[PDB]
Symmetry: C3
Subunit: 249 residues, 3 copies
């Protein structure tokens, strides 16, 4: 159950695998008002940009658990490049099978793909009244019918939760949402459009590869499928939750 060729082929140039932009991650760490030293656990650190960049701006400590590459010296050298490899640590580990030395103040997991979600680990290693950063997808605009949804590339509307229904889901789970950074059309266009050019280059790079057909097909509808439905429907964003905990009374 690997990753579909198309996805990987049409995202090999992306520096961010979701609608978020540099300005967005930058803002995130800002609104979080984290004091220097705040330890952070980041599952799915990937490039390690978030942790690295925050480490230099808000001056914090942290550790990323990447599950997308054999060696993660691409991020380890990233912290060195920013002169902060003494604060941010990285480990080639895949989610489960992990226990932190000491709890942290911010546990993040934006999720690999913007479509997927992933938390015991996130909660087991988070200090009481800690912030839990989670990137989740939602319906920016609830499609009028399954028809439009199925077109966007989704079984039923019931697959995604609407924004108000998403904040309603966190509350019913005992979670107290205290922050929210949502992506915008611009963020999305950058993410979705960047693919169209990447595929068109791939074709000019491997014309003899019998897969050019699947790319050609994808390209021929990619921009159409996006502007016609997805653009207005698909929504994404990162929520900062803080679980309601009962105390000694």
């Amino acid at each position: 159950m690997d990753i579909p060729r198309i996805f990987t082929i049409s995202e090999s140039e992306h520096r961010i695998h979701n609608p978020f932009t540099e300005e967005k991650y930058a803002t995130l760490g800002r609104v979080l008002r984290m004091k220097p030293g705040t330890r952070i656990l980041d599952l799915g650190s990937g490039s390690g940009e978030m942790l690295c960049t925050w480490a230099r701006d808000h001056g914090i400590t942290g550790t990323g658990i990447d599950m997308s590459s054999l060696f993660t010296a691409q991020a380890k050298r990233r912290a060195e490049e920013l002169g902060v490899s003494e604060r941010v640590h990285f480990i080639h580990n895949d989610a489960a099978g992990y226990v932190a030395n000491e709890k942290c103040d911010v546990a993040a997991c934006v999720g690999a793909t913007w479509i997927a979600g992933g938390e015991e680990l996130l909660a087991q290693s988070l200090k009481p009244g800690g912030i839990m950063l989670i990137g989740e997808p939602y319906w920016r605009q609830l499609p009028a019918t399954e028809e439009i949804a199925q077109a966007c590339g989704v079984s039923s509307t019931s697959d995604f939760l609407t924004l108000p229904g998403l904040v309603g889901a966190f509350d019913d789970l005992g979670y107290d949402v205290v922050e929210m950074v949502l992506a915008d059309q611009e963020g999305w266009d950058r993410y979705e459009a960047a693919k169209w050019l990447t595929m068109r280059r791939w074709l000019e790079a491997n014309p003899d590869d019998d897969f050019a057909a699947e790319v050609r097909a994808e390209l021929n509808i990619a921009p159409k499928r996006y502007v016609t439905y997805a653009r207005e429907c698909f929504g994404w964003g990162v929520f900062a939750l803080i679980a309601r905990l009962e105390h000694h009374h």
Copy 2:
């Protein structure tokens, strides 16, 4: 003033949808110059004057109250220091009045010079609330409390002024303003749990996030309108 407003915006830098970038854009867009005099009736946080005072070397004086204290900080901290002040009619007729945060036209008028610019921060209906109740949920008495965007520009026109510039707020701007309130409240509930007016702040935070994303996020509109009298 519900103290909640003082708590939810306990550490806000801009007590309105506007962002830092928004206040700087209004300034340059107004193509002002060194020697301009303003009167911010409703100064609030005080970011507007301080900011422009720096990147535009402009005089001025804000009025409000006690955020007046908060607005004082920035002045000393920015390097401007007494280029703008904080503490209604002015006996100097500012080169440009303002009321960020109609009807308040009768005031700015009695304190603005002829052919002068008039800034007006006024909220509006970015999108009419599907139904009265929805509008009541957003925290407003009735739909008639605010006017649509075109309705508001039409009001300014029927008052003699022409809109020469206008900087409105965007969703992003709103989230920043609304979300921050949630975090500030939850920080208060953990700093003053065994105090009074907490089981109420606990109520605000219990609904604030739900209320916003559900109704307000796509109805609440705001922005400042620069106006110059005609005739």
Copy 3:
């Protein structure tokens, strides 16, 4: 008309785009330093000057206005890159570059050819094979329900422009793959329309005796309303990176 020259004499960018939106286009375009560009109706060459400063591209911009061609030449000089770009005063309705260009562009001034399908014939006549073609065209962000409304947005008919999917679907019907897209946002529109309202007023108080004073004053009287009441919701804008299939 001349109302265009008066209201946009101070503008730096003559469309809903913003400083950031231009930077984005040029960066997402992934251009190697040395790329030759051709802008037809480059207005104040703000697009060629900036990309030449942050990407090392080269190009020339043709525009009917001498005032803009002046601002462009002055702009390239200001950014210290007047060596990479060249601005000439001339017509673009039928311009053709002596040498093919890595990217031919007609952003905004797509009316110089007819609409946008006529702009394809032009650029494509000086664009290296598999070259990138930029097209700045407005679209119905929200297709109106009656010609009245459309007539109240400053246009003649709803057939004047297409919708986002109708527009991209149109570039396709011409055998072009839309590989990149940078759409403008309402904010970008405000900065564009609002500027005119202040320029016209400023020009009005500085030329109360010019022949077009009557007209200008008339434009101002309804421009703010004409926009916020209609246009700001039905109109969309953007640049589309194209490349022959």
